[PDB]
Design a protein around this nucleic acid. Sequence first.
RNA 1: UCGACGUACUUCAUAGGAUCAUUUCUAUAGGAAUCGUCACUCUUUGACUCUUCAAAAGAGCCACUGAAUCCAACUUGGUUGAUGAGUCCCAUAACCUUUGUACCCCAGAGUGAGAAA
RNA 2: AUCUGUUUGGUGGAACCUGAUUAGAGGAAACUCAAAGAGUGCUAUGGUAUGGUGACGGAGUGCGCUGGUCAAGAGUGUAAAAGCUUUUUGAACAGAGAGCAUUUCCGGCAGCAGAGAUUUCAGCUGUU
Lengths: 388, 181, 380
Amino acid sequence: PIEYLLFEEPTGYAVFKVKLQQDDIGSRLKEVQEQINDFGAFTKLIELVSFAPFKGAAEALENANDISEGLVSESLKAILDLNLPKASSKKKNITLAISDKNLGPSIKEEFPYVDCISNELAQDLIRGVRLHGEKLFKGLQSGDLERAQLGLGHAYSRAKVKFSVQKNDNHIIQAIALLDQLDKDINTFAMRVKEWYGWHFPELAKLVPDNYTFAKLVLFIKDKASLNDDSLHDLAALLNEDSGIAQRVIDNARISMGQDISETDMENVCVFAQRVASLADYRRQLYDYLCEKMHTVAPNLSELIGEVIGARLISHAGSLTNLSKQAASTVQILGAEKALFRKNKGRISRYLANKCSMASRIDNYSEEPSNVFGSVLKKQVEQRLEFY
Amino acid sequence: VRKLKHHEQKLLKKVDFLEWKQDQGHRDTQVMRTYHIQNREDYHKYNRICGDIRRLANKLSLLPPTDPFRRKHEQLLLDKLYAMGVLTTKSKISDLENKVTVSAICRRRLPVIMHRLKMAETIQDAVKFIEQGHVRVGPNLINDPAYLVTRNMEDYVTWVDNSKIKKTLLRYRNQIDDFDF
Amino acid sequence: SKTRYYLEQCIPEMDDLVEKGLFTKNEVSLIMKKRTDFEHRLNSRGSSINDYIKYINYESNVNKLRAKRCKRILQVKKTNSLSDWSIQQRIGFIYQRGTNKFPQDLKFWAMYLNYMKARGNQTSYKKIHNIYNQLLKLHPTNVDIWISCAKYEYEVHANFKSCRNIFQNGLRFNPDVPKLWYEYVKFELNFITKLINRRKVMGLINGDIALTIFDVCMKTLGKHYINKHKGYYAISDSKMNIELNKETLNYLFSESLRYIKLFDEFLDLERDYLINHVLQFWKNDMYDLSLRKDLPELYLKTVMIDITLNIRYMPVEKLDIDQLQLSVKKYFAYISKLDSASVKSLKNEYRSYLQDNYLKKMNAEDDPRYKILDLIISKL
RNA sequence: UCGACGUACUUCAUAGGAUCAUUUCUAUAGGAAUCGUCACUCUUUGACUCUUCAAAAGAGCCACUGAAUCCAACUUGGUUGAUGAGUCCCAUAACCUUUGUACCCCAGAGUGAGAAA
RNA sequence: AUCUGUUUGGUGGAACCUGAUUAGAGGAAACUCAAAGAGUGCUAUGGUAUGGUGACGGAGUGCGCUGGUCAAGAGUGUAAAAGCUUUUUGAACAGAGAGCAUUUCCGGCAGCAGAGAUUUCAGCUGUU
Ligand SMILES: [Mg+2]
């Protein structure tokens, strides 16, 4: 006695009409089970009458939640109202086949004139619609059911888990992996800048050993021939004259062995020196972000040892959750290759590692960690330090 | 024909387009293959000769066992068939019925005897050498591969004198004497 | 096979054509040969909607040829027999088969509805309704269908009640489409204006409802726009939430502005009363953003409409100095509450509006109001 | 040499259940098959051409008319480079040694209730 | 080394024995030509086949059908009720196209004006 069928897709709600009723007494016979697999046989059983796609990703999640809770959404109420004919509440009722029994009482409340069925006969039809999928929709735009399932699946799962970007600690791992890379590249490129300008003015590389200062100076003194008293003051403003380099360069540029390189070559040196300048500034900007992120993600661990050292420790474990799950001994050897925590010296290191382990646990398993426990835990280490 | 479904096979049990009872199991084709018989009706000419022997043996068997006529004639038939090579042994009279077959006669054809004498690697190769005039029985060249060789005449099957095959045999062992050729 | 059954259904017609003398047997043979090709095309695998379109066009040409031989040979407009309605019946059946096979193709649905509407006498309107009932169920989210049947029943038939229920039901499926809101309000204002023009007609021979739709339109459209651009999740960042709130305000402001333009057409309605409601709506704070502080540019336009509201529709001939004095009086009041940069922009726009609408259309020598307007423009 | 007796030794049965055999039905209702074809992938077999082990025989001779290969000759390119020849296991590299710089000399899936007096 | 002679790897494959096969065993080529097997793809959809033989269709009337509201009736229950069942009837209202009749009009011909791109439809008057 099934006349209509409700099927819930990730894309929307589909309503079918049952053209023929399959045999119920012989439901378990093989030939009635095979017709569900065969599309030629199945298409004679049901036909699509309506389809109402969701507006977007947001609506899909809301109706996924409502269907999970056995509730009738406004969208579901609209499609059913448009399709199901009006019948008597008592004399005779339009029959609707639904997959979930919990959804029956909800639909009955909204539509008193529809009787819901979810017996094994109904399930067999629902199984067939799921089996053949988009083939039954006669080309109607159902998107791609497999792809939307992936998006909706992650959305539904995280919403129950209440997953947040705040719990994210991989930003720390990215920052540390990038920060040391910048420290390598800044040095490697800065060394090259010393060589290239070394050809044009080799002694100056000796005058200003600090590479970052050398790059800024080279950006100013592009050609050692150009030497003015005002220029001396301007480069004297660069850094300080305490080292006396301002006088040395002017006297030394006058008498030097550097062979003049072409204008195009100088253009590369200044631009490449300009490049070393940008990464240095970006590195400092990223370093502050790592410090800020550490406080938010792991205030206890950052406060106890430090933001950078904590960031290195999290990366070594591979994640904050991995660090927490480790025993105290494993945490100690986790930082024993770079000496992160470093006979009496070892005793502090072993003592400090245990506290760091507990600090990680507070951070990892707290939705909004505080630094209150980090402060006292660090204080306990300080007393241990003074004692030893 | 395509493989018959279940309900079709039940209603078409006796349908066979490739094997019939009158074929007798394609025994003729099988035997023609084993001994490389090129004439389609050579088997059935042999079969009629085998039937004649089997008819006589049956009639003799129905004569009383101690009959001198019965014993004489059965021995003559056993003597003649053994001499031809059709029968391997002369001991038992039941061989006239059980062991008289077309395969026995085909086994005395010239290609097969060449094969057993190792003059050819296969019966097919022996047929080709006969058809190409390399083979002589006695002083007579034979290009008919159906020639039936008796036991006595199997001693005179040999290569033709100027055969290229004969030179290869002697050249291989470094025993070629060009005076002979 | 299905093809043979359909070909045999043609035989009673083709026999009638021969009997009436319109077609010869050889010509009848050629027509059936072409139909045999098409029926096979439709009943086979790989059929496409183009096969249905071709077979419908072919049958149409046969009908035209039959009609012309009817006048040429029989010399009658109609021969009372099957051949009159056989082709028209057949064409409708090809449309049913095509739509069932390929419900996705909206072009074919439009052709089916146009064909049946054109022969109104042959096809009862109830059959038109069945097509729209079936089409609407298959594509509830295509607002064009909802407007189409809403339009069809309001012009051909003029069922405001059923045309209303279409808009009520259409908005139930597609509350996030501003176009359907715009058309629904357009119908209501048409219904009122037709009613008032009907009222005007009786006398010689003897708008709030739209605004409610506008108000719910503003509420509903904003809700869906937030649901979009957020994806599955809410936006944790406080700043990005405020940006999303601005987008809705700018989005809703543009949609509300279109309604302001829509009111302009309806002369019969007290549009100034209709406009003032829209302005009163934007005075209220929405989504914890005040128009004056966060989006001054929108607020300046709102003040602009309010200042010119009383004089917007006053023709140059009927220009009243008192209303201008009320208009300018509104202008100074807003200045005292506006920043210098905002005042400069409003001052420039107000000058331009007065200059283009009135000053350039006023004769300088004949109208004393020209000097007053020029003095006002100079002082502004 | 045969008998009888005694002794020793060899051999012989029979059951329960299912399936296949009737151009439906092998006797049982506990079992399972009734559709006028349109494509694509894969697999098996056989022809045709050529060929190896691996050879053997040429329906045979003349004439005309095409084709292919190898030499000679000539023409182009060629020591200012013809021919032959593993980029594809980073010679844009790996490994070893020396030097310089910064750190390290306790257990490791570490142990698990002592310590101080 | 006119030393030694075992092992490892390659070449080779007598005899005996065992197994399989046999018009001997193979190889290469393909937008070639055949005969078959398996799996997969495709709306692959008449549970009784278009609204229609002037044997007709459209418009409208009536009957019929549907929904709930109200009123009354019957039953049950009560001290009296309230409450519940009703294949009991009626009223107005809201409808479906989903059946049955209906000749009441229209679909022959001419004229008026209107909507859309010479053609399509709607209306009005005369006429068969
Ligand atoms: Mg037995």
